[model samples]
Target: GEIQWMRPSKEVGYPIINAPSKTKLEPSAFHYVFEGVKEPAVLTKNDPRLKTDFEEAIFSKYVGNKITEVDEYMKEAVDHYAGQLMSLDINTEQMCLEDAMYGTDGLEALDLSTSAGYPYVAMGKKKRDILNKQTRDTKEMQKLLDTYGINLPLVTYVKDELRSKTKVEQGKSRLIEASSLNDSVAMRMAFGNLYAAFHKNPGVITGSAVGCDPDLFWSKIPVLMEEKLFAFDYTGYDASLSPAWFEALKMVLEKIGFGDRVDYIDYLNHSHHLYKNKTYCVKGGMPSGCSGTSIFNSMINNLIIRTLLLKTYKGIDLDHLKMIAYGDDVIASYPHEVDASLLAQSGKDYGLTMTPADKSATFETVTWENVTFLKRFFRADEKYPFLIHPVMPMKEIHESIRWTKDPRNTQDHVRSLCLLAWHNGEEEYNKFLAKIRSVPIGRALDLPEYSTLYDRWLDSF
Candidate 1:
């Protein structure tokens, strides 16, 4: 070797410290579980309207009273449907099953379970709050297990003598308190697959029976809907449109450049420069109406057809608009120069075929108000009924119509309606309106008021 000074090569620490200036940072392990930036591994397309052979097997014959008859029909359908799953490839089916399970976990539960299972695990985010989380005292977990016998402070144990002295009911089972933990958190979660049967077919005629309270039985909304028990026509399902349109106008949510923020709706409502109560507006992207259908049908309508349509078109946003339940409806007012084509074109674009019957029953701005009050009938606030708009002043508007101060709320109204009622003819239409709209109980049937209204609005054949 030549007499070269033994100088360290620049590569010594370059592997650890230095890298190209343009090097990209790797995503954290957390990104692997979530944000899986890669394309979804399992993409199952389904239609917005798919009634499987399995679903058809149920209710083979239309009974005089469908509410009573629906149970046996759906039970048969689900059993037959589950049986069909038996032939699916075990490994592939496992992947599908896991994919289906994606949104079910809670924020707390997922973070906890992902890091480590229960008991030994502790929460990191709530360190300050957890400072006093364990009131266990120098307790059940004792020091020097062999040296110190298992004895905890007497305060941790419940004693009848202490209870009697304190005049508190001790030595009694607090089963009711314990039961609340299991049931009160969520009605949908508790009901689980049972609700699947109720809304197996989603739409107005069949869904008018849906009530807001998740805890409510599916059987109740129909009777009230039929009888005109609330403030407006059955929460406007017959006339309701999609949520995305309103959301779009208020905030350019997911616009070309604006970032994703949950506050889009809120920001739009408070924007006094552009919005006013008298000039209230609602805009949104169309809800593609895919999930309500069968797995197979959804693929055809949403995945394949929608994808192709979007690819074919240029500049236009390719979205679908599905009819919503009574409460999800919107009402907008325009100046004297209103475009008839607005309704015609929007209806044509979204494939919303308004039947002559539904058109006859439709009401506009005030009708939306009437729907809100009726929503109160089933506890709209607690169910936290969402307008699901590009942006709407629904929260503020709802506060204006609230009849009760109690916090009972609304759940997803569309699904509930689809689960609960069956549409009849014009008679069913009038009946549904009376239930939710503020019509006097006996007056909805008066032909003069309704007949004149319907014939003028819809131009009866």
Candidate 2:
């Protein structure tokens, strides 16, 4: 129940408060989400590489030819991949029967929808600045509702508007974010699970795929995701979907839902990002920060994986083939090396560009990442598949370490500490806790309410 205060360094400038008067906070290299504390300076437009980086964005896929072949491709096949999904008996022709159930509510749908998490940011004024309105009076059902007696001055709506865009880079490579918040939310609402056949976690490639219990998923992180056949991790699946928020909602079209919404989704799809003050476009993958990327990318991975499985394993033959996927990281057993022989090649057709990487992909016992040992070997595997070095969250380590009135964030930190307590033996837990007490953010978070959540998550199991 006692404490200590520490600061990361005098260079970052923070005050330590109320503890066993000490200051020796050293840095820890356990990044849960791989963010460096310092912001990299933006590349200025004057550089030629900045100008050249944008050229790659413009094609996206099509360079218009003498025959409009490029336009035709992006228009039809490139847009929906309908024929592809259809080939798999996905019933692309029907909406209600597309996946599971049917719903008939706009308010229900809209309520489920997300926008600026909408197309509108009504953090305040139900108005459209979304602010003070001087324009047209209210809406459709208003007069009838007014006559009957109920009306709201606070209903919201949106129109199709040009979404903006931008890019970030170090010149040799290109990366981007869309001012596509609305684009993301909208696309998520429409095509989203709307288009793809929804599957649960460890989808179709695990024992759970064939109706097994959740915990016995046959999917393992440290060694065993598959057995009884030739299992392989498809590789590129994990290549994306990291920190897709700054780092990782919507609706429209459901009212008049049909295949026409497919074209509507695609047409609204592309947007431009600014690089060196010029507009540029790119394609193949979905937008970097959009929900569409998460949804659509997973959709492609699922479809492609499902298709490959179906083709390789004839009918019930796949039931014996154990499979599991988390994002693009896949581990599935195959009946024949011939199936896996084509796997690395087959994924290429979908542009997965699957490469058999070292250590992790080479074996079932993957090191998602690992630090070496042999100074000793007691419970070494615990640190092997990451959560490396029995660490702490890198919240405000490089900056300030002030305690929060907000319990949620700090509670999660303490929940982590509590977990470290649960995860390690008492001696080691105390050792780690002793180090935590010496650090600034760790000390800031070591609070009573925080401990409450930690204890709550703890044996509450």
Candidate 3:
């Protein structure tokens, strides 16, 4: 109901609109998901660790190696279905199932038979540039692999032959891509349930795992405050895995007998050149895509560092040194100077060498990169002049708005608009509604005259 014009400060470029005034603007309301539902829906006060059967079943066993098991399972599956393809009366015994699925000469035939009509999708120039860059990179990587006599495992696809044979399932052969199916589902649900429960609980291992939801990171900052812990985040996590280090990782897994059976150790690939799970390799980061990859990598990382800290720093009041990781991005809370050095050294041992920029520490504020976890920034002092933070960077705000314009991506649209309103304020949001209405009704599917989609969306929110 009011327009407030604020000026930027000459001293530190602080805005007149900074702090307490901005704090009134709750960014929590702008969050896309993970809002309202606090107080772990499923977790118990008994402890932060997995206590239930579901949690125990998923995490106790190969939480790390589960991905590997899924990969081998799916690989065998593709071959099994491929063997079944010979019985389909297509009469091509000379062709292996993997070749039939991805071979260049065979690709066209495969596409015609089962590529969902090979539809063409539209893209903007910026998107086109990104796609083109990836294409160039793919070819470049292919060339390098060929030149270096490199071979990485290929992902295979298989049709559900059992389903295909059914009369109700005729002409609708559900395709399954080679991946860690069982483990992926198990880990995914386990993490989801874990987060649903223990995300609100704190201490020891926190953030960056399945049950340890990063989505709740912002909401749980008060817990950090209660425990007097600091947050430290890491960068360049995946790139740190060098061939030597990754091989070292494999050595550890081998000793553990994690992937002793199936085509688990060796790589698979459709490209003529060889491929292995390296830092930037396509699909290399996925659990099924690259056996003993991120989960195992993180597992080893935590074990090495945590073991050293427990042994040397025991009863030394270094409880804050506990680290929680989500893939490569690590957040260490309640750490001391000694812990920092240990982290750098331990990270190097596993190839996650930490540079100065790789780690960040904060006592009052919580952030990942420039973005605030709370969707708002907080300066150190509670009563400091700076109130709420800038909603989000203007660049991020504008980008979010642009994404919401696309009808196909309704999910992001709602989130983008929510941020638009929360950050830009209600007046700016009204202007957006006006702008949407200005776009001719038939011009975009995002705005069809036949439906009250826009009104419904606004009202629903």
Pick the lDDT winner: 2
- Tell me the tens digit of each residue's lDDT in model 1 across 74-100: 233223332322233112111112112
CA lDDT for candidate 2: 0.32
Estimate, for each residue in 340-364, the C-alpha lDDT of model 2 and write its tens digit: 5466565454344455433244333
Q: Which 10-residue window in model 1 sums to the lowest lDDT?
A: 173-182
Give per-residue lDDT, candidate 2, residue 437: 61
Off by more than 4 A, model 3? 1-152, 156-207, 211-217, 224-235, 242-301, 304-322, 335-346, 356-394, 400-407, 410-461
Query: Could you give me the TM-score of model 3 versus the true structure?
Result: 0.37
Off by over 4 Å in 1: 1-251, 255-327, 337-345, 353-461
Q: Per-residue lDDT of 1-461 in model 3, one digit per residue for the tens? A: 00012122333322121111111112222223221211111221132332344323211211121021222222332233223222323321223322322222312111222211100111111222212321223343233224433232122222221211221112221212233222222222222222222223332333224233222233344344323232333433342333332333344333333223212323311111111111112212222233224444454344434433444455534334445444544445453444455545544443344544223442234333343432343322223322232334343443344322234455455444544344334455555455544544312324222124334323431
Q: How many Å off is the CA of 421 in candidate 2?
A: 9.3
- Whole-model Cα lDDT of every candidate shown, in order: 0.22, 0.32, 0.31
The count of residue-pair clashes in candidate 3 stands at 20
Better of 2 and 3 by lDDT: 2
Where in model 2 is the C-alpha error above 4 Å? Answer: 1-176, 179-181, 191-260, 264-276, 307-316, 319-322, 334-342, 357-431, 447-461
